[PDB]
Each structure stands twice: as C-alpha cells, then as structure tokens.
Swiss-Prot record, chain A:
GO terms for molecular function: structural constituent of ribosome. Keywords: Ribonucleoprotein, Ribosomal protein. Transmembrane segments: none annotated. GO terms for cellular component: ribonucleoprotein complex; ribosome. It holds the Pfam family Ribosomal_S6e. The keyword ATP-binding does not apply. It comes from Pyrococcus furiosus (strain ATCC 43587 / DSM 3638 / JCM 8422 / Vc1). This is Small ribosomal subunit protein eS6. One of its GO terms (biological process) is translation. Residues 88-107 are annotated as: Disordered. Belongs to the eukaryotic ribosomal protein eS6 family.
From Swiss-Prot, chain C:
HAMAP family: Ribosomal_eS4. GO terms for cellular component: cytosolic small ribosomal subunit. This is Small ribosomal subunit protein eS4. One of its GO terms (biological process) is translation. It comes from Pyrococcus furiosus (strain ATCC 43587 / DSM 3638 / JCM 8422 / Vc1). The keyword rRNA-binding applies. PANTHER family: 30S/40S RIBOSOMAL PROTEIN S4, SMALL RIBOSOMAL SUBUNIT PROTEIN ES4.
UniProtKB/Swiss-Prot annotation, chain D:
One of its GO terms (biological process) is translation. InterPro entries: Nucleotide-bd_a/b_plait_sf (IPR012677), Ribosomal_eS24 (IPR001976), Ribosomal_eS24_CS (IPR018098), Ribosomal_uL23/eL15/eS24_sf (IPR012678). It comes from Pyrococcus furiosus (strain ATCC 43587 / DSM 3638 / JCM 8422 / Vc1). SUPFAM superfamilies: Ribosomal proteins S24e, L23 and L15e. One of its GO terms (molecular function) is rRNA binding. This is Small ribosomal subunit protein eS24.
Swiss-Prot record, chain E:
One of its GO terms (cellular component) is cytosolic small ribosomal subunit. GO terms for molecular function: rRNA binding; structural constituent of ribosome. This is Small ribosomal subunit protein uS17. It holds the Pfam family Ribosomal_S17. It comes from Pyrococcus furiosus (strain ATCC 43587 / DSM 3638 / JCM 8422 / Vc1). One of its GO terms (biological process) is translation. InterPro entries: NA-bd_OB-fold, Ribosomal_uS17, Ribosomal_uS17_arc/euk, Ribosomal_uS17_archaeal, Ribosomal_uS17_CS. The gene is rps17. Keywords: Ribonucleoprotein, Ribosomal protein, RNA-binding, rRNA-binding. One of the primary rRNA binding proteins, it binds specifically to the 5'-end of 16S ribosomal RNA.
Length: 123, 124, 242, 93, 110
RNA sequence: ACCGGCGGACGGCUCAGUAACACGUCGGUAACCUACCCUCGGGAGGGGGAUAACCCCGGGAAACUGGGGCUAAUCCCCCAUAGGCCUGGGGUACUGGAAGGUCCCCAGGCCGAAAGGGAGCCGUAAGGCCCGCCCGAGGAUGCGGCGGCGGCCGAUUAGGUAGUUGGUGGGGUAACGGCCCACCAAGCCGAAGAUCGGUACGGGCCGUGAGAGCGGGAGCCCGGAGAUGGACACUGAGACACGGGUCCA
C-alpha cells in the first residue's frame, strides 16, 4: 500500500494518492527517473486536480521515503540499504562546511518495503 | 598516509619509540609517474597554506630548447633512457633528467613534471 | 598540543618594555601585527588608559578611539590593539598635545611631549633596499613601512640611513647618512636611551653585525650594535631627545 | 565637612573629576545623598549631571577619601558612564 | 675563486660538484670549528674530532669531552686522516651530514 | 531563518607515555609557510548559472528525512588583461663580506584575480566623505626545520645496526633532508658505557642546610604531549580537530 505524491510542475501543486491491490505489482522493480504512461497507473488525476489532462500524460518516479523514513537515491543501484559516507546527494544536509556524515539510505530500485514514493507529471 | 617523519632508528642503530603521533604537515603525497600520452592531463592540488600545485600526469608535448636559446613546442614520441631508474624508461614514465625521443631527436628533460606541470628539455 | 595561532596573552608574560602592573589582573590585550616588532611597541589602549589616564576602564578608551579623536602619526586609528613603536608621534589635536615614544634608560617606553612643529616629522631608518619590476627601487623602513623611488636616485639611499619622513602626506624631507660624526640616539642594548656621536665602525664577518663606537656628549666611549643606532642629526639632534 | 584636593578636567569626555576628603571625626559615615548635596553647593554643579562612585573610609581613620564625576549634558552619562551609578544615585529607577 | 668571506686561500683546482662552497651551489653560514680528521672511509665524507675540557661544580676539576662531527668533504681538498681541518655549518645535506670542510690547515705529514 | 564574513585549530583540562635535538641556552634557514594587521604601486571590465525562507502535499515511537512551485547577495561558474610558475639564451643594477637569489631583454609553455555595500550631506545626476574586494612588493604576528653544548640509574645488560651509513641520479614535501625510490660502496656506533633494560615530561624554581652540598619538579609562567586503547580521512591560512566526522575493541 503505497502513498504516491504526484507533483505537477506547471501548477506547482502536489497531491497524495494511495495505490493498493495488483496495481502495487506494477510499481515493483522500477527505478528512479523511470517514465510510465498514466493509463495503467489507474488514478483519476483529471478528477483530483480538476484540470484536463491529455491522454499522453506520463509520470516519472523520482523520490520518496521508506517506512522508517529512509529516502531514495538514484545513484545507488539496487534497492538495498548500504551505509555511505554522505558528502552530497539526497538524504543528507551538511551544516558545517566540508562535513561528511555516514548515513544509511535506500537504493534506487523500488522495493515493497517503500511506503512513500514521489512522481512528477509530464504531458 | 605517506609519512615523511623521523627515521625510526638512531644513527648508532638505536631503536626509537615515537613519543608523539604524525602531524598533518609532515605527510607526503603520491608520486606522479607521469606517462606519455596523446593529450595533456593535469591536476590542480590545494596545498599547505592554501597554495596551488599543478601536477602533470599525462604528457603529449614538450619545450625542446636549442643551445642558442630558442624554444619549440614539439611532441614526444617515446623515452630513451632514464638514469634515475631503469624501470621508468620501459613504462614511458618521464622524470627530471630523463632522455626522451622526439621528432627533433634526443632531448634531456630539465623540468619537474610532478611539480611544474610542464615538460621542458634541451636538444642533444 | 597547540594547533593554530593564538589570540591571548597573560599579563605576567607581557614584554618588559611596558609600564603595567603585572599582578593587577590575569589577562592583557594581545598586540596585533603591525608596523613594529613586539619588543618595540605597545597597544594603544595601555597608552590611553594608563599613560594618559583619560579612561579608567578599557571600554571608554575603546569608545573614545572609535570616536577617532586620537591621531597616530596623522592617521586616525580606532583599533584598541594597535602597536605604537619607537619615535612614533601620537597627536591629539583637541588638546593640541603631541608626544614621541622613546626608550627609557631602563629600556621601557616613555612619552616625551613635543611642540607642534615636531608633530609632522617622523625619522625612519632604512631597514632594507630592494627593487621591484619596472626597475622601481623600494626601501623598507625600520617601522615596517615601505616607500618607492626610481632607479636614478638609488645612490642617495642606503640601509640604516635615516630619513625625515613627512608622515601627514608621505613626503620625504631630508636624508641623514650613516657616517662618522653623525649624532646618534640608541634604541636598544645596555646603552639604551643614550645620545652621542659615531666614532668608529667595526665591521664584523661571519654573520655578526657591525659595532659602532659612540662617544657621549661628555666624551664617554661605549659601543653598540649598528641596528640599535638611530641617526637624529648631522652634528646636533634635529629632534627633542631626552 | 568636605575639602577638595583634585579637580581635573577631561575634555575628550568633557567631564570633571573631583577627588575630595570628608572629615567625620567621631560620627557615623556620611551617606551618598548628603555629600552629593554638599559638594554641588560650593562647586556649583548641575545635580543631575553629577555622579559619585566611591567614598572609602579607612580603618581607624576619621578622614575618608571620595571621588565624584561632573558631566555637562544628560546624554553623556547614558552613553559613556556605566549604568550602576545612576541607579545607586537614583538617576535611573 | 668566489669569495666565502673566511680568511683562507681557496683550494687551487676547482671541482664541478654542486656542493663545493668555492665551486658549487651551497653557501657558508653559521658556526665554524677546527678539528682533526680521524675517519674518512665513506665517499666524500669526513668524521672530524674535537677535544676540550669540561668543568664540574662539585669537584672543581676538568673532564675531557669529545665531539665527533660529520662534514662533507668536496674533492677540491680531499681530506685524509691526521689532518687539521676547518669546518662550517651548512644546509641539511643528509640524515647525518650537516657540515662542510672549508680549509685544511696542516696536512697529515705535519 | 538558508547561503554568507569571522570564531568554534585560541582560551578549558591532565602529567598515563616520552630518555627523545623532548627540553635549557646559543647560532639557525641562503632550504620553508603564513588567514586576521600595516606601508607602497596597480586593478576591480563583460557574461551566464544557482537553491534555501515561503506554498502544498508526505515517512516515521525513531534518529532523521522526500518531491514539486518560486528566489539573492560580497553564492558559483565563464571570457579578457594583469599576475603566478617552469625552462633555455643573453646582459647588467640591488640586498649581503660570502653565495646564490632579486633585476632587464629575448624565446618556449603552463597556470591564470576581484565586489561592491546600508545610511547620511551636497550634487538632476556625476562625483566627494564611511566601510568593503583583488594582484605585485615587503614588514610584522605566529609556525615549520637544522646544528654546537648542558641535562638520570644498572656490567649478575658487551658488542650493536640492514634502509642500516654514505655517494650517484631521481621522486614527494610549503620547505632541505633516505623523508622515499633505482643503482653504487661498506659504512655508522661502542670500554670516556653503544645496545638492552629500569626509571622519568624539561626548565624558571622549591625544601633543608653556615655553606660546599643533598633532595624534589604537583601547586604560578614558558616549552613538550595527550581527548578510553587504537586507526583514518574531509573542510579549513591554521587539525587528523574535547562540546566536527568515519572504523575495530
């Protein structure tokens, strides 16, 4: 049961939806930056956002957070957890200049353990 | 860590145990082992006191100078002889004082490519 | 152990050239780098607070310096750690009061009051000669300032020569050379705060500086390092020297 | 009875420093307000521009030293002089 | 003949080494000493010895103390054992070498 | 509040080790470094990009963390000139007795600056006063490094040393140096005490004593060194960094 945060760049508005059922199996095994057409995603986006969407609307998967709160990183192949000394990239805020913190983050690939996923709309 | 610290032995062979650790200022750095290539590849390194050291790792051109004093930017074919050590010449590794084969002929390098970043030599 | 530069100085370890109560408090103001050396100068705050007594507390001395009332060789200096060295002229025009810092016989610095006519002349000893690209000669003075001249006039200058230096607008006035008979005032050594005339110049090899033999006004002959001898006049001192 | 030795003018601050001695043989130490009203009379100063810090009476001594300051304008104390000796003198609540 | 500013005649013949104070690159500064050569086995190296007395507070007699110094020996002088030699401080040459011979006052035969 | 200028590398603490060019003193860099400071000469032109705050919708008892909408400077980057560096040839002028270095020209090659700003007065503005930025040249504050001498005990610890010692030619260093590498050679130290072990931060000083002297070095200052034992990077002018970071126990 995933929470999908669908963000529209044109409106700058993002709305959360829930994916359940065999629809979930459609998202298993995908990566970050992956594009997918709207039709099989089965969300009434035109009806949530209240604005017309041509049938050629696609969604790109970019981000999200895990059950505990572990975010996503395109850089790390696979879905597994690997402790990494974080100098730059998602899931890390350096405060003092030159800081490097070792954080544990989820890999790029989408796993069932993910509960929050983020997608961006294109037309 | 490359430590350019105290010799761990006395002149009379006496063992010395270090009373203190390694300070940051006293460590060294990787030898360049500059190779001959079709292009010129360089690295700018931040150093002690915020200075900058340019380090040539791949070399493709050289300043061959005549005894008169004129310089020419001419390419490098291969290395002839390295009196410093015989393994470098086989591996096309260039260092100060090495003999290099170029279009003009034989040249002796009077430069420090690991520190200077450039290759200057005199025709022979 | 220590890892980088420090911003503190205990009152006990203060230089011996200062008139300060050493056991009054724990801490003293660290002199920032400046024109002179550590042994040669003092923070301005100690001049204002102690020598002049205008301000009882350091805070009000800092306030007054921020107001800029005090002129240091014709330049306002609001910093409260500025080092003021030998033969610097401190002028406060509101009182019209002008003093010159000079070494004591004991070797500590003291303020000699001077008239207004002496407040725009500073004598500077030529510490070193160099020359920069464009063939522009440069002279580094004993007080850490630098002046530029052209190549033609280079023979009119030498190291250790004194120059009367119009500091209000940076105008050279006169050049006093380093020759026998010149009137000389001592800056350091056991013969500190003495004035006499040069007699002999003892050149010394092996890195050892030259020794100059100075005869006092009464004819007493002593010796002193060349660096410590400051020429102040051709035959008679051009400045009021205790 | 109060008699002066030191009357010194600091024109960078435009303020007068008064070092004075109080004769109090056999009687308790005078208070701040009494000497404050005493000096101002024969020195002819503005009471509000005038402030006292310390009055030290030594052991076994009937003559006590004291120091007062005399400013000119109402902002000089607010800027330069610290905030205690207005409150101790009542100049600030 | 390039001056070093020490009162001694330079060695006659010149050498091409970059370490001869008269005929090289390195310069002379610092302390000077006089000693005797006792060992010169390794290449262009000398081990000069200097003898002196040391006083002690408790017994007020003297105690001989010796100082061995490793100075560089350029070819222009070619020091040997039994020779009295003038030595000068130099830049760090090697792990132990920090001095150089600048004069030979008496040969071994003397 | 985010970038951003600085400080957090000093100041606080202890005496476990460390017999050491650790330290005391004297020379000592000609073989080095230097943010914040001062003086002199010059520059500060043109162009592009940038994401916090905020809006919304999200994960988790957590720690802590995602996306999209939008934005700046003295944030970043690009172009130009100077400037920095190296090499060859030539010719001088300066520092210093010395050396080389610094300088002028030619040649080749590489690298290769900036920032304007709140307010106020006048000025239509411009421009002046205040503060701020960069290049060259120093000085200065500190720092690194080399050497001579001084500074405990054991002979029921007598030979010790293999990169060891020196040379040639190279590397890395801010910098010279076997510090490191290839070759060349057998050197180096020791009975005046090597090596090994015991013991121990050095000094100004302190206790006692008529003093010769004996003993001690915690309490205040200087120097040396260490964050539980150990090991390691990044960022910064400055660290392997007590209230920054990573790994084993």
């Amino acid at each position: 049961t995933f929470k999908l945060v669908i963000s529209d760049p044109k409106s700058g508005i993002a709305k959360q939806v829930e994916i359940t059922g065999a629809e979930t199996e459609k998202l298993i095994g995908k990566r970050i930056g992956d594009q997918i057409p709207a039709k099989e995603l089965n969300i009434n986006l035109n009806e949530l956002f209240g604005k017309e969407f041509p049938e050629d609307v696609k969604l790109e998967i970019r981000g999200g957070t895990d059950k505990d709160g572990f975010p996503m990183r395109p850089d790390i192949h696979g879905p597994r957890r690997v402790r990494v000394l974080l100098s730059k990239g998602p899931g890390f805020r350096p405060k003092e200049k030159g800081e490097r913190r070792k954080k544990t983050v989820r890999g790029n690939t989408i796993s069932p353990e993910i509960v929050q996923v983020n997608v961006k709309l294109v037309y | 860590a490359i430590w350019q610290g105290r010799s761990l032995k006395k002149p009379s062979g006496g063992r010395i145990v270090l009373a203190r650790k390694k300070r940051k200022r006293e460590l060294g750095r990787e030898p360049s082992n500059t190779r001959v290539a079709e292009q010129d590849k360089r690295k700018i390194i931040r150093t002690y006191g915020g200075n900058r050291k340019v380090r040539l790792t791949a070399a493709a051109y050289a300043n061959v100078f005549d005894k008169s004093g004129k310089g020419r930017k001419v390419r490098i074919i291969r290395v002839i002889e390295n009196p410093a050590n015989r393994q470098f010449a086989r591996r096309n590794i260039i260092t100060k004082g090495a003999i290099i084969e170029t279009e003009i002929g034989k040249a002796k390098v009077t430069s420090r490519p690991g520190q200077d970043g450039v290759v200057n030599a005199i025709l022979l | 152990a220590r890892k980088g530069p420090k911003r503190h100085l205990k009152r006990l370890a203060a230089p011996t050239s200062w008139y300060i109560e050493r056991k009054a408090y724990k801490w003293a103001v660290r002199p920032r780098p400046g024109p002179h050396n550590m042994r040669t100068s003092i923070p301005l705050l100690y001049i204002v607070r102690d020598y002049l007594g205008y301000a009882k507390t350091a805070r009000e001395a800092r306030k007054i310096l921020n107001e800029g009332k005090f002129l240091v060789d014709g330049r306002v200096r609001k910093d409260y750690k500025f080092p003021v060295g030998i033969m610097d002229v401190v002028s406060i025009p509101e009182t019209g009061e002008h003093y010159r810092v000079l070494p004591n016989r004991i070797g500590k610095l003291i303020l000699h009051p001077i008239s207004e006519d002496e407040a725009f002349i500073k004598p500077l000893r030529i510490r070193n000669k160099r020359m920069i690209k464009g063939a522009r000669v440069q002279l580094n003075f004993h007080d850490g300032t630098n002046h530029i001249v052209s190549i033609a006039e280079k023979d009119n200058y030498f190291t250790s020569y004194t120059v009367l230096m119009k500091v209000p607008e940076r105008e050279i006035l006169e050049v006093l050379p380093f020759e026998k008979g010149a009137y000389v005032f001592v800056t350091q050594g056991k013969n500190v705060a003495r004035k006499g005339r040069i007699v002999e110049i003892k050149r010394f090899p092996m890195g050892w500086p030259d020794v100059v033999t100075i005869e006092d006004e009464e004819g007493e002959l002593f010796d002193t390092l060349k660096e410590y001898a400051f020429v102040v006049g051709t035959d008679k001192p051009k400045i009021s020297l205790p | 009875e109060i008699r002066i030795k030191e009357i010194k003018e600091n024109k960078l601050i435009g303020r007068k420093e008064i070092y004075f001695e109080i004769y109090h043989p056999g009687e308790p130490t005078p208070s701040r307000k009494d000497v404050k009203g005493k000096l101002v009379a024969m020195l002819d100063l503005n009471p509000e521009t005038t402030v006292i810090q310390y009055i030290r009476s030594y052991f076994g001594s009937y003559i006590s030293k004291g120091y007062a300051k005399a400013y000119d304008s109402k902002e000089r104390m607010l800027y330069i002089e610290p905030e205690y000796i207005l409150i101790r003198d009542g100049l600030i609540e | 003949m390039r001056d070093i500013g020490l009162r001694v005649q330079p060695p006659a013949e010149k050498c091409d080494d970059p370490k001869c104070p008269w005929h090289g690159n390195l310069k002379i500064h610092g302390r000077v000493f006089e000693g005797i050569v006792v060992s010169d086995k390794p290449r262009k190296t000398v081990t000069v010895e200097r003898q002196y007395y040391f006083y002690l507070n408790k017994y007020e007699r003297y105690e001989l103390r010796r100082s061995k110094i490793h100075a560089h020996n350029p070819p222009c002088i070619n020091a040997k054992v039994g020779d009295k030699v003038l030595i000068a401080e130099t830049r760090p040459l090697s792990k132990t070498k920090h001095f150089v011979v600048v004069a030979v006052l008496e040969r071994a035969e003397e």
